Amino acid sequence: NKIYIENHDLMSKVPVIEASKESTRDDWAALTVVADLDDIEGQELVYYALRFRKSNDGVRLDIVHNPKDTSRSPSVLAQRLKSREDKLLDFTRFLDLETALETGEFEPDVAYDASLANFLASSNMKAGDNFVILNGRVLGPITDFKKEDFEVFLQ
Numbered sequence: 001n002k003i004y005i006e007n008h009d010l011m012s013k014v015p016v017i018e019a020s021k022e023s024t025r026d027d028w029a030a031l032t033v034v035a036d037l038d039d040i041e042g043q044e045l046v047y048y049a050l051r052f053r054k055s056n057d058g059v060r061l062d063i064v065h066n067p068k069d070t071s072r073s074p075s076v077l078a079q080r081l082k083s084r085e086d087k088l089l090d091f092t093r094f095l096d097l098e099t100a101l102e103t104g105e106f107e108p109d110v111a112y113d114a115s116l117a118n119f120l121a122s123s124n125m126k127a128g129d130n131f132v133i134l135n136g137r138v139l140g141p142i143t144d145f146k147k148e149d150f151e152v153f154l155q
Contacts, residue, residue, distance in 0.1 A: 007122075014081075027057075083106075
């Protein structure tokens, strides 16, 4: 649990696709993708995670933006994505995601940026790293991994 418990601030601010009400408890699982969405390789991972969630409605997906470069507030992209949180399964096209990360004025959330900086240090992962956490299991860094590999780890 301890990852989930120590980080409630951050995890409360990130984009979340809730598992469906009409899925079962045996289907239910918790996927976190942590990705640098300034880079294609991070975006691509999230895209796959989205596609996976689209097919597997027992999963609760949330997405943590974890940029290597911090000159911009991490919280900007995270808010861009959080604003468009309902829309995320309507994506059909890698471009829909790019678009969603491309636009939206937001005021930096410092408390978010702090939360992130904890989460990283206490979870011994670095800024910029791409990884997934699946029901508590950290997998990464990811330096391939597509929606197959999500599927299998669910089994």
